[PDB]
Structures are given as structure tokens and as C-alpha cells.
């Protein structure tokens, strides 16, 4: 139930002149690990900086660390409860962490914080695998779509909603509509991919994921999802290679020492270990326990760079 962000102690950005600009340059260079350290430094130096907390939060999600993402976005939300990108990110990370109620609440705050849509809050307004707020969210989002059908973000929010109710074929249509309206959005491509995989269409998901990687080559979360798709297809050696790549890039050689990274990296190593067991390669399992990348870089021909 942690509310304090566990800052990485190994952070050279704490003595950089311009960490915020560095972080944004690192995002532009597709380096999530470095961008997160830079935003962390900003959050330590300027704790009321809404943008630094928000960017730390979205960057950690992209770096496959939802737990840190949520803590960072929760700070951003405290400082500015109208920050709509904060609500959008929280709805996503909550959905991933199966916090269905928090995801519903974030979707509502996302819509109702928008001047375009806030009037919908004044409107006077089971057979679904969701709680009852889920029908309300449906009405609100469909009312918004009726007055503004070509807002891609309305479609993306329905996609999130339909994930929460395990309606993955519907979600996929939502995210398809969102990428049609905004095709350069790496996040939306990833969401379509995850939705297809969750709906047992890993071959289609891999297509979406390759689109997202084309846009953001450092999108560690997409690389994790690629491993998941291969794994669900029982293509264990390919999954093991992809997760190794995810791991390598998640660290980016920033060499983290903090408790935060300790727990957030473990789920990637867990997936590697399960893949190793399904490959009948128990001889590699102990290295997976010690989180030692070296034998995997060697094993999967990734010695050059991830």
C-alpha cells in the first residue's frame, strides 16, 4: 500500500544541470531507463513538479514497471487532480494490475476532467463480467462517442473498459479504431497488441507489436508482450530471446541498486525462468534466479546489444 516513491540511489542525474530536458531527450532517443532516472532526479529536486511525476509514471509503464508507474502517477494526481494524461495512464496500469475498481474510477476521472466532456457528469446515469460502475462507464463513454466520434482517445478508453470485462474482441475493435485515427501512437499499437494476445490472437498481436517498436524502438513493455505472445504460442526459445532483450534494455546498463527496481525487474526474470523450464533448460535456471544477464546474452546471440 506504498505511497512513497522508492527512488533509485544510483542516479547521476541528481547532479545534472538540466535533468528534465535530459529526460525528454532520452525519451526522444528511445531510452526509457535513462529517461526514468532523469525524471526521478526532477521529482527529488522539484517534488511539486506535476509534469516530472507524470513523465516518470508513463516512462515506468513503458519500461514494464507498473508498480512504480502507479506510485508516480498517484503523486501527479495529488498535485493536479485534473491532469487527464495522469488519469489515462492510471486506468491502463490499474487494468494491468487487475485493480478493476481503481481502473473504473480512473476512466471516469479521465472523461469528467475534460471540459469537452464534463457536462456528461450531470447526466442522470449483471450480464457483464464487471461490477455495476462498468455499466455507468459504458453509458458515459458511448454518450461521449456520440457527440465526438473521431476522438481516438474515446476509442482507446473503451478498449481499456472492454479489457476490464474480458471482452477482448470488442476491445480490439476499439483499439483498431483508435490507431486508424492516430496511427503514429506507439502506445495505442501496444494496447491493440496486448488486447489481441489476451484474446488468443498472438499472431495478430505480434503484428501490432512490431508497429509499436517501429515507432519506439526502446519500448520495453512491447518487448515483454512479444515474449508473452511467443510463450502463449509455445515458441519457448523465441520467447526466452525476447524476454532477454526486454531485460537488457530495461536496465540499459544504468545498473540499478534500489529496492524499486529489485521488485519491478523480478517479473521479467520470472517469465525467463518459466520459459527456461519449458525449454527443458534447468541448467540455466540459477542464473535466472541471480538475475545474471551474461549467460542469456551468450545463449540467445544478443552479446552485441540486447
Amino acid at each position: 500500500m506504498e505511497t512513497n516513491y522508492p527512488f533509485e540511489p544510483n542516479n547521476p542525474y541528481m547532479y545534472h544541470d538540466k535533468p528534465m530536458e535530459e529526460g525528454i531527450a532520452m525519451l526522444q532517443l528511445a531510452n526509457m531507463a535513462e529517461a526514468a532516472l532523469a525524471f526521478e532526479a526532477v521529482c527529488q529536486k522539484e517534488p511539486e513538479n506535476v509534469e516530472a511525476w507524470r513523465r516518470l509514471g508513463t516512462t515506468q509503464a513503458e519500461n514494464e514497471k507498473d508498480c512504480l508507474a502507479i506510485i508516480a502517477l498517484n503523486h501527479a494526481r495529488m498535485l493536479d487532480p485534473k491532469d487527464i494524461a495522469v488519469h489515462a495512464a492510471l486506468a491502463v496500469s490499474h487494468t494491468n494490475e487487475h485493480n478493476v475498481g481503481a481502473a473504473l474510477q480512473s476512466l471516469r476521472s479521465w472523461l469528467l476532467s475534460q471540459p469537452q466532456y464534463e457536462h456528461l457528469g450531470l447526466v442522470d446515469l449483471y450480464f457483464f463480467a464487471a461490477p455495476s460502475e462498468y455499466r455507468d462507464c459504458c453509458t458515459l463513454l458511448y454518450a461521449a462517442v456520440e457527440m465526438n466520434p473521431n476522438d481516438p482517445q474515446l476509442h482507446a478508453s473503451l478498449g481499456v473498459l472492454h479489457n476490464l470485462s474480458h471482452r477482448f474482441d470488442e476491445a480490439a475493435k476499439n483499439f483498431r479504431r483508435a490507431v486508424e485515427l492516430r496511427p503514429d501512437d506507439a502506445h495505442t499499437w501496444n494496447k491493440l497488441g496486448a488486447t489481441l494476445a489476451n484474446g488468443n490472437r498472438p499472431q495478430e498481436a505480434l503484428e501490432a507489436y512490431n508497429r509499436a517498436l517501429d515507432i519506439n524502438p526502446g519500448y520495453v513493455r512491447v518487448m515483454y508482450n512479444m515474449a508473452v505472445s511467443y510463450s502463449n504460442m509455445a515458441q519457448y526459445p523465441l520467447a526466452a530471446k525476447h524476454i532477454t532483450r526486454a531485460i537488457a534494455l530495461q536496465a540499459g546498463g544504468t545498473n540499478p541498486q534500489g529496492e524499486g527496481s529489485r521488485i519491478a525487474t523480478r517479473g521479467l526474470w520470472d517469465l525467463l525462468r518459466m520459459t527456461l523450464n519449458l525449454m527443458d533448460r534447468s541448467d540455466l535456471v540459477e542464473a535466472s534466479w541471480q538475475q545474471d544477464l551474461t549467460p542469456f546474452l551468450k545463449e540467445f546471440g544478443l552479446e552485441d546489444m540486447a
Binding site: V160, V228, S231, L271
Partner: peptide, 5 residues
């Protein structure tokens, strides 16, 4: 496994 949005 579950894929992440």
C-alpha cells in the same frame, strides 16, 4: 500469460 496494455 497476460499481456499488458
Amino acid at each position: 500469460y497476460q499481456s499488458k496494455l
